[PDB]
RNA sequence: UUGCCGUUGCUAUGGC
RNA sequence: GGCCCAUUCGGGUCUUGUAAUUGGAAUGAGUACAAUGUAAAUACCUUAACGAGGAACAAUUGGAGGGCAAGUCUGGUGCCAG
């Protein structure tokens, strides 16, 4: 009854935890019970993960948010107070949620793909992201599928990454879900299979969608740290 | 010993089945509680008495 | 298991008489069980012979079959050919059981003394006390069949008959 | 005052023939019909008992000079 | 004489706890004798005898070894907070009965 | 070609199993287990320690100060030593005596301190295998082992007992019998920096104990002849060798599992390998071990082989065929009984009955680059293992030890770059298990100490 | 420097 | 004296029998201390104490053949046949 992304062992139970509503969707997130209890194993059961949630160790996106099924989606920096645990969780190359450990100056921010820019009411420019941070007043040159950098103390955009040909992009969606390498090709079609294409070890080619891909930095310099093997 | 409860249960059922037809009803009553038997057991005992389908004798 | 084709011919009756008497068996079901699975084994090895050399099935399943037959211990280390699996037979299989092996190693005086030692738990291969007589010891567990350390024929405290006789003679 | 039942009403082994202690165990019966069989085998064949035990005392049972117990061909 | 072996000792700061697997060794004894095992565990680790706990005991065939799950706390009060109520009924001090109706 | 088809089909099989280096190469389960690895405790006992003391060619060899302190005990059998983090040593003999030495006076011969001699007084009054709880040895003490902390020495032999003596007084604190009739102990080894003893008993059994709790941990089974030698390091692994089954096993003792390593040298293929252009042959019995580090060990055989084995290869990595020579052939005045030298020479059959010396002692200094081999060739040999860990090589010899070497081990001194060691070797005129040894060529029952430097 | 015994050194060896 | 073959006469073979006495060992079903397990309890696992001579702590089912009475019945060319 589980998805593939959670890295959930089959010998666990019968009812799978539906995440509650929140920032991200159901299909692109993992809740805190499947995060803490059975992935990096700070708990043994739902009772004691509710106990540490009542103790309020979790500090995801700089706020506490004491809830069992809180849908932590892409790169919400899970922060735990004891042993200064800073966790940025991204996608691995085979579809799961690889939770990388980072440090404090990297967990002081996150980034987010812009979805739409609106002239909503009363002359106010407007920007949303995958956690829905409706932050005030970016520059006019925010296209769709660019990348804002959230402040995580206040909410303001601090840095901006422009989407164009020659940018380091992350793909979350479809049969390319979780690949990095961002350059063999660029092809913007007019309604589907439109993208920037991603290399491999032998620099192979790949096809995805615009909304299923979003930028993380430059060719060699992302200010996100990434795990390795 | 619920083990010996089950063992003597089966042995009484088989010895009763050699004296009555093979497939008569042996009923099991538990301990007496407040002067008389448990009313669940007496309820389905009366359920067994209520369907018995008597056959006519000769004398 | 399964019953044989003609189960009551006189050769079969004298066969089962010799087998049960020479190996201390209780009934026909021991012979019939071990012969049923031996029938499966060499009915498979017959097909492995009816296919040809350099067949993948023959190469891999043949050396797999003779190596796990050698490790059960019914086949010696040097005959690593597949026709010896056809030459294999039923008392080669029930010489490997623990009752036969306890008697042959000499912890018992007969196969019946071996059967009652095993069922009275004085015999342990390796770490665990084995207590059923038809156990099919392997070529590595062949040399650790010894008396259990929980038993008076090992080194343990003597049983109830010996200690009650000692107490009554102390009275 | 408890008129307990007894063994013949309890086990109900009504009117059986006299049976065998060796039949009460399936293993001991085949132990003792194999000992009987391999005592009969000494009658039909001549069984190799294990060779010369001590000093060769003699044939201990007789030598027949007329009997030849050998299989002639065709 | 019982014998004790801790293995795979990790620390849980979120639950203020230190947990491990417990190979308990009793040649020619019956089994683990869990209160005596909590005594032996509380003296091989530091004092906290009402904050050390074991729950998952499986003895292998033929006796001798048994694998259990050991978790030891500092601060007996937060051990009472974090442990479940049935294990507190089993070992420590808590006793609240359920209302018997229907 | 059938083996070629087997190799080819196995290669295709493994390729198909793979079917069912990029810039991003991170795996979620591996990094999660590495987070648990960062969370855990006890990076102390379980170091998979490699060879960190590379000093084989460094120290001197040829001018050791060799003192052969002869002692009056028939057939010394074992040697146990001790260093804290004054040093004591222990010897034991076939005359049922344990003897404590001080050894810390490094530039001179060791000093006797205390006897502890069992005898016929300690035979039990029962002949019953579980009331073997006497306080002394009545038969043939074979092995001593000092504690890594030094509270106790623990010894045992053919009287199927483990007597644990205190250090400061040589008194029997506790007796633990091995509870069966053939339970003679043959080798003892503490795991390093601990209180856990691994005894190897001739029931094809390995017993383990905690000495300061007077308890037995685990009995572990699985050799096929008598477990003639044992060896351990700081890890809870152990390495035993049974004699004639020609296999050496190593035991994950908590898991109670093992890795077996058989021998497998054949004079047919070996003489063909020489025939491509010679007195070397097959194997009798693997006899002695010492675990050099937590990935390699070395075995001493019965045909004079010394072999070097890894943790990742069944067959051995390196051999050294003749390690102490071949024995002097029996004389023509002691073979035949004819009159003429021609027939008494014909009764030698040429070279067919020359038998090699068998290595009866082997000691690898733990995690170091150098080990020491000993037999009754009169000369101990010192070998260093090459830094790529796929070979060893004879450095030098220590030729002041006339007799069988029933035990070798070393005693350390000096700091990280300047070091000096005294190699103790128990010397007898008779093998430590049975007699079997003729042509006692100037042997004496002593302690061969050598002081090696630099 | 030892179970005796010999050379001993004023310490090393060799016969049981 | 037992056993085996054979239509017959007979032949072949060999330590074989006996409600004969007797001896100390073994333990398992059962009875049961517990502890473990588990929300709790059952069960599995581990386990001290007792537990065999008709070891009566009393397994069956089916087959082949006799032999006996101051006995009974039938036939008929005594004493027989059935």
Swiss-Prot record, chain A:
The keyword RNA-binding applies. Residues 30-93 form the S4 RNA-binding domain. GO terms for biological process: cytoplasmic translation; translation. CDD domains: KOW_RPS4, S4. Keywords: Cytoplasm, Isopeptide bond, Phosphoprotein, Ribonucleoprotein, Ribosomal protein, RNA-binding, rRNA-binding, Ubl conjugation. The modification Phosphoserine is found at residue 20. It is found in: Cytoplasm. Belongs to the eukaryotic ribosomal protein eS4 family. Present with 573 molecules/cell in log phase SD medium. Component of the small ribosomal subunit (SSU). Mature yeast ribosomes consist of a small (40S) and a large (60S) subunit. The 40S small subunit contains 1 molecule of ribosomal RNA (18S rRNA) and 33 different proteins (encoded by 57 genes). The large 60S subunit contains 3 rRNA molecules (25S, 5.8S and 5S rRNA) and 46 different proteins (encoded by 81 genes). Component of the ribosome, a large ribonucleoprotein complex responsible for the synthesis of proteins in the cell. The small ribosomal subunit (SSU) binds messenger RNAs (mRNAs) and translates the encoded message by selecting cognate aminoacyl-transfer RNA (tRNA) molecules. The large subunit (LSU) contains the ribosomal catalytic site termed the peptidyl transferase center (PTC), which catalyzes the formation of peptide bonds, thereby polymerizing the amino acids delivered by tRNAs into a polypeptide chain. This is Small ribosomal subunit protein eS4A.
From Swiss-Prot, chain B:
Residues 29-38 are annotated as: G5. It comes from the Eukaryota. It is found in: Cytoplasm; Nucleus, Nucleolus. Belongs to the TRAFAC class translation factor GTPase superfamily. Bms1-like GTPase family. BMS1 subfamily. Interacts directly with RCL1 and the U3 snoRNA to form a stable subcomplex. Component of the 90S small subunit processome also known as 90S pre-ribosome that consists of the 35S pre-rRNA, early-associating ribosomal proteins most of which are part of the small ribosomal subunit, the U3 snoRNA and associated proteins. GTPase required for synthesis of 40S ribosomal subunits and for processing the 35S pre-rRNA at sites A0, A1, and A2. Controls access of pre-ribosomal RNA intermediates to RCL1 during ribosome biogenesis by binding of RCL1 in a GTP-dependent manner and, via its affinity to U3 snoRNA, delivering it to pre-ribosomes. GTP-binding and/or GTP hydrolysis may induce conformational rearrangements within the BMS1-RCL1 complex allowing the interaction of RCL1 with its RNA substrate. Required for RCL1 import into the nucleus. This is Ribosome biogenesis protein BMS1. The gene is BMS1. The chain holds residues 179 to 237 of 1183 of the full protein.
Swiss-Prot record, chain C:
It is found in: Cytoplasm; Nucleus, Nucleolus. Its main location: cytoplasm. One of its GO terms (biological process) is ribosomal small subunit biogenesis. The keyword Nucleus applies. Residues 96-170 form the S4 RNA-binding domain. Belongs to the universal ribosomal protein uS4 family. Component of the ribosome, a large ribonucleoprotein complex responsible for the synthesis of proteins in the cell. The small ribosomal subunit (SSU) binds messenger RNAs (mRNAs) and translates the encoded message by selecting cognate aminoacyl-transfer RNA (tRNA) molecules. The large subunit (LSU) contains the ribosomal catalytic site termed the peptidyl transferase center (PTC), which catalyzes the formation of peptide bonds, thereby polymerizing the amino acids delivered by tRNAs into a polypeptide chain. Present with 106000 molecules/cell in log phase SD medium. There are 2 genes for uS4 in yeast. PANTHER family: 30S 40S RIBOSOMAL PROTEIN, 40S RIBOSOMAL PROTEIN S9. NCBIfam families: PRK04051.1, uS4_arch. This is Small ribosomal subunit protein uS4A. It comes from Saccharomyces cerevisiae (strain ATCC 204508 / S288c) (Baker's yeast). The lineage of its organism: Eukaryota, Fungi, Dikarya, Ascomycota, Saccharomycotina. The gene is RPS9A.
Swiss-Prot record, chain E:
The gene is RPS24A. There are 2 genes for eS24 in yeast. GO terms for biological process: cytoplasmic translation; maturation of SSU-rRNA from tricistronic rRNA transcript (SSU-rRNA, 5.8S rRNA, LSU-rRNA). Component of the small ribosomal subunit (SSU). Mature yeast ribosomes consist of a small (40S) and a large (60S) subunit. The 40S small subunit contains 1 molecule of ribosomal RNA (18S rRNA) and 33 different proteins (encoded by 57 genes). The large 60S subunit contains 3 rRNA molecules (25S, 5.8S and 5S rRNA) and 46 different proteins (encoded by 81 genes). It comes from the Eukaryota. Its main location: cytoplasm. It is found in: Cytoplasm. N-terminally acetylated by acetyltransferase NatA. Also partially acetylated by NatC. GO terms for molecular function: structural constituent of ribosome. Component of the ribosome, a large ribonucleoprotein complex responsible for the synthesis of proteins in the cell. The small ribosomal subunit (SSU) binds messenger RNAs (mRNAs) and translates the encoded message by selecting cognate aminoacyl-transfer RNA (tRNA) molecules. The large subunit (LSU) contains the ribosomal catalytic site termed the peptidyl transferase center (PTC), which catalyzes the formation of peptide bonds, thereby polymerizing the amino acids delivered by tRNAs into a polypeptide chain. This is Small ribosomal subunit protein eS24A. There is a cross-link at residue 18 (Glycyl lysine isopeptide (Lys-Gly) (interchain with G-Cter in ubiquitin)).
């Amino acid at each position: 009854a589980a998805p593939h992304h959670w890295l959930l062992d089959k010998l666990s139970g019968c009812y799978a935890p539906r995440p509650s509503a929140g920032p991200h969707k159901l299909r692109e997130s993992l809740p805190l019970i499947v995060f803490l209890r059975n992935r990096l194993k700070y708990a043994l059961n739902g009772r004691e993960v509710k106990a540490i949630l009542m103790q309020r160790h979790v500090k995801v996106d700089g706020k506490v948010r004491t809830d069992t099924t809180y849908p932590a989606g892409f790169m919400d920096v899970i922060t735990l107070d004891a042993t200064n645990e800073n966790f940025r969780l991204v996608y691995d190359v085979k579809g799961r949620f690889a939770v990388h450990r980072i440090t404090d100056e990297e967990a002081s921010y996150k980034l987010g793909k812009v979805k739409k820019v609106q002239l909503g009411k009363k002359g106010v420019p407007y920007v949303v992201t995958h956690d829905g941070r409706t932050i005030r007043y970016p520059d006019p040159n925010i296209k769709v599928n660019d990348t804002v950098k959230i402040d995580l103390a206040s909410g303001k955009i601090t840095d901006f990454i422009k989407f164009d040909a020659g940018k380091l992009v992350y793909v979350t969606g479809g049969r390319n879900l979780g690949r990095i390498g961002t350059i063999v090709h660029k092809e913007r079609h007019d309604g589907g299979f439109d993208l920037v294409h991603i290399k491999d070890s032998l620099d192979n080619t790949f096809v995805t969608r615009l909304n299923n891909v979003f930028v993380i930095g430059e060719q060699g310099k992302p200010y996100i740290s990434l795990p390795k093997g | 010993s619920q083990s010996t409860l089950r063992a003597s249960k089966k042995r009484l059922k088989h010895r009763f089945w050699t004296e009555v037809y093979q497939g008569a009803k042996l009923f099991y009553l538990s301990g007496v509680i407040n002067g008389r038997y448990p009313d669940r057991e007496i309820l389905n005992l009366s359920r067994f008495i209520s369907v018995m389908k008597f056959r006519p004798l000769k004398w | 298991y399964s019953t044989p084709k003609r189960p009551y011919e006189s050769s079969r009756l004298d066969a089962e008489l010799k087998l049960a008497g020479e190996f201390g068996l209780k009934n026909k079901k021991e012979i019939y069980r071990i012969s049923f699975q031996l029938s499966k084994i060499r009915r498979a090895a017959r097909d492995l012979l009816t296919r040809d050399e350099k067949d993948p099935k023959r190469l891999f399943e043949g050396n797999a079959l003779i190596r796990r037959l050698v490790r059960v211990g019914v086949l010696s280390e040097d005959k690593k050919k597949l026709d010896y699996v056809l030459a294999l037979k039923v008392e080669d299989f029930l010489e490997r059981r623990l009752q036969t092996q306890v008697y042959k190693l000499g912890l018992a005086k007969s196969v019946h003394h071996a059967r009652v030692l095993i069922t009275q738990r004085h015999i342990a291969v390796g770490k665990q006390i084995v207590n059923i007589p038809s156990f099919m010891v392997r070529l590595d567990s062949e040399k650790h069949i010894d008396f259990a350390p929980t038993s008076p024929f090992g080194g343990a405290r003597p049983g109830r008959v010996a200690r009650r006789n000692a107490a009554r003679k102390a009275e | 005052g408890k008129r307990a039942i007894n063994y013949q009403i309890l086990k109900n082994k009504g009117l059986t023939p006299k049976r065998n202690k060796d039949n009460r165990n399936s293993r001991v019966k085949k132990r003792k019909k194999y000992q009987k069989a391999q005592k009969k085998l000494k009658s039909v064949r001549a069984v190799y008992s294990g060779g010369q035990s001590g000093v060769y005392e003699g044939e201990k049972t007789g030598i027949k000079k007329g009997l030849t117990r050998s299989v002639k061909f065709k | 004489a019982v014998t004790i072996r801790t293995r795979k000792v990790i620390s849980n700061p979120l639950l203020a706890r230190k947990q491990f697997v417990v190979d308990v060794l009793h040649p020619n004894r019956a089994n683990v004798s869990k209160d005596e095992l909590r005594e032996k565990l509380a003296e091989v680790y530091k004092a906290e005898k009402d904050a050390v706990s074991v729950f998952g005991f499986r003895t292998q065939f033929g006796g001798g070894k048994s694998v259990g799950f050991g978790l030891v706390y500092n601060s007996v009060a937060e051990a009472k907070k974090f442990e479940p109520t049935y294990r507190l009924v089993r070992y420590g001090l808590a006793e609240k009965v359920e209302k018997a109706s229907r | 070609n059938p083996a070629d088809k087997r190799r080819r089909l196995a290669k295709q099989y493994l390729e198909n199993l793979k079917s069912e280096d990029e810039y991003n190469n991170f795996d979620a389960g591996d990094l999660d287990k590495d987070i648990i690895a960062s969370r855990l405790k006890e990076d102390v006992a379980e170091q998979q320690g490699r060879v960190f003391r590379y000093f084989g060619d460094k120290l001197l060899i040829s001018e050791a100060k060799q003192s052969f302190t002869r002692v009056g005990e028939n057939n010394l059998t074992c040697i146990s030593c001790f260093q804290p983090v004054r040093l004591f040593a222990y010897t034991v003999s076939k005359d049922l005596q344990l003897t404590k030495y001080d050894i810390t006076d490094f530039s001179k011969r060791p000093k006797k301190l205390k006897y502890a001699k069992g005898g016929a007084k300690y035979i039990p009054t029962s002949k019953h295998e579980y009331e073997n709880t006497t306080e002394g040895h009545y038969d043939e003490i074979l092995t001593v082992a000092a504690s890594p902390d030094g509270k106790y020495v623990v010894t045992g032999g053919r009287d199927r007992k483990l007597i644990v003596w205190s250090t400061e007084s040589l008194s029997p604190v506790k007796v633990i019998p091995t509870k069966d009739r053939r339970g003679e102990v043959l080798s003892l080894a503490f795991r390093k920096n601990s209180d856990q003893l691994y005894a190897s008993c001739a029931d094809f059994k390995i017993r383990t104990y905690s000495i300061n709790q007077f308890s037995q941990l685990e009995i572990l089974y699985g050799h096929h002849d008598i477990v003639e030698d044992i060896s351990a390091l700081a890890m809870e692994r152990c390495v035993t060798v049974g004699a004639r089954d020609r296999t050496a096993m190593l035991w994950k003792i908590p898991d109670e599992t093992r890795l077996t390593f058989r021998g497998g040298d054949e004079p047919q293929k070996l003489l063909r390998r020489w025939m491509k252009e010679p007195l070397f042959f097959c194997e009798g019995s693997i006899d002695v071990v010492s675990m050099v580090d937590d990935f390699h060990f070395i075995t001493g055989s019965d045909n004079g082989n010394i072999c070097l084995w890894s943790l990742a290869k069944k067959k051995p990595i390196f051999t050294e065929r003749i390690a102490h020579g071949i024995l002097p052939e029996p004389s023509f005045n002691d073979i035949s009984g004819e009159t003429d030298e021609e027939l008494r020479k014909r009764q030698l059959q040429g070279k067919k009955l020359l038998q090699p010396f068998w290595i009866t002692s082997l000691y690898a200094i733990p995690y170091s680059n150098v080990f020491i081999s000993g037999s009754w060739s009169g000369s101990l040999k010192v070998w260093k293992i090459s830094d790529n860990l796929r070979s060893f090589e004879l450095l030098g010899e220590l030729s002041g030890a006339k007799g069988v070497v029933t035990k070798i081990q070393v005693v350390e001194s000096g700091k990280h770059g300047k070091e000096k060691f005294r190699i103790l070797a128990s010397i007898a005129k008779e093998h430590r298990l049975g007699r079997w040894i003729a042509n006692v060529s100037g042997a004496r029952n002593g302690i061969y100490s050598a002081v090696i430097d630099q």
